[PDB]
Design a binder for this molecule. Structure first.
Ligand code: ENA
Ligand code: ENA
Ligand code: RK3
Ligand code: RK3
Lengths: 473, 473
């Protein structure tokens, strides 16, 4: 768990992303942990050539403009520097991979590198990268996300926005990008990551949006790390910097941009992981097959499964089922009862009955893996089939459990149902920290209660629902 | 009379202009006598601002380029300077007026002022001024001459070729003008006036034409003033400058451009006046009316007039006649005999019979003035009409003589024919210097012989022809 402000932001932004109305605004700071050297370090020889010192300079745009002025406006050196630096092959950080995995269809970047594009490519996602006005007129077919590199690309250094001339001519040359960013800011919920909010173009666009929409501006989010006490600095200077940052954050809130203050930069990764987990765990994989329903009678167990599926649908969960013999019909009935109040939404219930025959069993493993990949939580019930006239614990449920563990999915074996479910519950309780690291007391109590045969249908269903909810929320 | 080289050049260039295959290339030096201050004087504050001295500088293009470099490439100051200087209202010099009066249809100028355009306008000539690539695609209807301002216009200072950047980008931006000038240099006979041949664009174009045509380049002419001994300079430095100028002229001959060395800049005006006189005097106004042909018989005088007109046509003269009673038919017969050897060319014989009646006499004066304006030499014969049955000296011939004198036309009254012609000859001999200033001994002898009644038809005709030829040639 994190700070209550962080928890509220995580809930709100997960809600925004699940509606596919969220955009990510990534600054250069999101790529500073990857391995690219700092822009000030690159400009250090540039500053030394005009007799200045990059460490004593804070406005690097004016520094680059001075360098260009000293060379009759020529940018060849700076173009070569940025091409040499930001085109290097660097391993992607976890933040880029998580952002690629999230269902985010809009990225706006002020960085010249192609880390977002590579992260989207490695997720088998089609990325429509735009850094030219002409490129706005063409859309890639079946694209997953669109990346607006509003400061240019690394492979086109001459069109990168680096000097004051570029910023001054941006409003004329790149006006369609300004219009697109204004439309996104008024129509989408943005998350600013790695952005210092010192960009003149972004200040201009935000001021225009504020002038247009007054107090009815859309709420956006930013992630900013708190000020850290430098070794040379004194306590008074640190407190002054903290107050300055507070005034900065309250003025960004003038643009209806709420700032989340983070202790360190790894909290960005933690927040992204939490959002990804909240999105992924909303889909539950219901597994099991039952000819004999352990201690419970047939009708009682059927009603239990029906009401469990109805509660899962009611709690805004998407059920994926393999249509196991003896369990599939009743989860289908529960979903139908919950939804027919109507049509079957494709997202709420995904049914994947296994092909029957010799041909089907060849691809059964890939079918099972594809079915499980859609989910983030696996729920196992019973696990008994009939082979030679006798009830024998099934083997498909074990494969399903193995696949779920290999995909880092949460496993919720209900031991009260018995058979392979009870075996899996015993296995999980044998090594609880391996499957649920850092579990709370309530989570342990719910997991232990999952193997209670004295619970009624309602009590067991409520225990399962609460366990799945604390896993997801 | 001038130097034999100058006389040969005058003959050849008059021949070229009369064929309407001659072009004029005017440099800035042609406008330096009008009143515009020198370009070095304008750049003197410009040179002082960058710490240089315009007097110590010879390449003013590099000086302007240095000034622009010191101001981040801005040309506003130089544009304002040229607009303020070369757009002033200055009275046209005689050279521009003479060039406008000449039948020259092509001007190429490196000057930004509009003196050529104003000179063409004041002659009621339509001038098609071109200084933009687009303007080459449109032609003025019924234009008399086309002016290519290849270095830009004064009213568009930002497009003037002044700095090294303009010269370096001229070959790309103004390539159609380069092609047009190459075509004119290979298809027309140029006269370079006021041009120092230190222009990089002209050097490039001439080098390209030379590379294309080897020793078969078309001959062109230039007018260059000889070096003058400066008061501070010594004899050795003056001789060195003379030798340097001689080497400069031979190099120009490398481009098949023959240079006429002039003692002073007024010799340009003298040469232009001589060419204009040679062109204008080739048209002779034949005047007269005769009922009684003085001492000669009717048939003898008719044969004399016929052979005189035949000789005038044979000597490449264009006859303009008013179709006077008793003279017009026989000059017409002479022209027909000379030409039918065939059709009547409109230039060789212009016939302007006077309208008969009260309506005609109202416009008779303007008709006579328009008829005489086409000519440069007036020849008067006889001048006797019949009013009340008696031979009375005519009055139209006197008006024709007055109009010819008012237009500065040469008058050749033949006193042997008598009547108004004899009266006019006596009047001219009364004040010979007024009508023929600076006349030679041969001219005086011919004028005196013009009033000899002892001459035969052939002798009198030869005297008239020789007098008219020494007037023209
Ligand atoms: O140009 P710009 O205005 O887009 O950004 P900037 O001025 O270059 O980079 C300055 C910004 O870079 C941000 N920043 C620094 N390091 C990190 C970071 N954010 C996340 N992580 C993750 C690991 N490391 C970091 C930091 O939040 C700061 O606001
Ligand atoms: O190359 P460009 O086109 O820029 O010419 P420039 O270098 O500016 O002017 C230099 C040229 O201007 C010429 N020059 C000087 N004065 C006169 C003159 N020619 C005739 N007249 C008549 C009166 N005064 C003059 C002179 O012949 C010299 O070659
Ligand atoms: O029980 P298990 O071991 O694992 C159970 C899991 O598997 C999947 O459902 C089973 C099974 O109910 C279904 N099935 C239905 N009818 C027959 C049949 N399979 C073989 N038959 C021979 C004759 N009639 C049948 O075929 C799936 C594959 O077979 P297994 O994976 O071996 O089944 C679910 O997702 C369930 O979670
Ligand atoms: O002789 P002049 O004084 O001057 C002579 C000069 O003039 C022009 O030719 C005269 C004249 O030959 C012609 N003309 C012909 N027939 C008649 C007549 N004019 C009056 N008529 C009344 C009855 N029939 C006539 O009308 C031109 C105008 O009359 P004027 O100028 O008075 O003639 C030439 O260019 C000639 O050089």
């Amino acid at each position: 768990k994190m700070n209550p402000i962080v928890e509220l932001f995580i809930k709100d932004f997960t809600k925004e992303v699940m509606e596919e109305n969220a955009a990510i605004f990534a600054g250069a700071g999101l790529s500073m942990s990857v391995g690219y050297v700092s822009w000030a370090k690159l400009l250090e020889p540039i500053a030394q050539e005009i007799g200045l010192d990059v460490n004593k300079e804070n406005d690097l745009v004016s520094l680059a403009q001075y360098y260009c002025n000293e060379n009759q406006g020529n940018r060849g050196r700076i173009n070569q520097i940025i091409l040499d630096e930001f085109s290097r092959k660097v391993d992607l950080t976890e933040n880029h991979k998580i952002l690629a995995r999230l269902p985010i269809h809009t990225y706006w970047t002020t960085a010249y590198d192609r880390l977002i594009e590579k992260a989207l490519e490695e997720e088998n996602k089609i990325a429509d990268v735009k850094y030219t006005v002409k490129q706005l007129a063409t859309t890639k077919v079946k694209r997953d996300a669109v990346v607006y590199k509003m400061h240019g690309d690394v492979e086109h250094p001459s069109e990168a926005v680096l000097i004051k001339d570029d910023y001054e001519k941006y409003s004329i040359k790149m006006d369609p990008y300004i219009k697109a960013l204004s439309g996104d800011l008024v129509s989408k919920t943005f998350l600013f990551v790695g952005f210092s909010f010192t960009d003149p173009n972004l200040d201009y666009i935000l001021s225009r949006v504020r002038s247009a929409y007054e107090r009815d501006q859309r709420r956006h989010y930013c992630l900013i790390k708190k000020e850290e006490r430098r070794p040379d600095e004194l306590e008074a200077d640190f407190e002054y910097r903290v107050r300055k940052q507070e005034l900065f954050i309250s003025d960004l809130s003038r643009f209806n941009i709420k700032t989340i203050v983070l202790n360190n930069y790894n909290e960005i990764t933690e927040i992204l992981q939490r959002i990804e987990n909240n999105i992924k765990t909303k889909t539950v994989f219901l597994s099991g097959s039952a000819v004999e329903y352990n201690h419970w009678e047939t009708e009682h167990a059927e009603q239990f499964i029906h009401q469990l599926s109805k509660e899962l649908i009611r709690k805004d969960f998407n059920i994926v089922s393999g249509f196991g013999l003896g369990v599939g019909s009743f989860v289908i009935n529960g979903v139908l009862e919950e939804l027919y109040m109507g049509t079957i939404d494709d997202d709420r219930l995904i049914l994947r009955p296994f092909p029957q025959g010799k041909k089907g069993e060849e691809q059964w493993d890939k079918y099972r893996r594809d079915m499980i990949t859609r989910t983030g939580v696996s729920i196992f019930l019973y696990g008994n089939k009939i082979d030679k006239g006798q009830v024998v614990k099934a083997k498909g449920v074990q494969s399903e459990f193995n696949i779920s563990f290999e995909q880092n999915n949460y496993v919720v074996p209900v031991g009260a149902t018995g058979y392979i479910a009870k075996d899996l519950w015993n296995k999980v309780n044998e090594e609880f920290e391996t499957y649920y690291p850092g579990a709370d007391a309530r989570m342990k109590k719910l997991f232990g209660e999952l193997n209670n045969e004295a619970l009624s249908i309602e009590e067991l269903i409520n225990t399962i629902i609460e366990f799945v909810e604390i896993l997801s929320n």
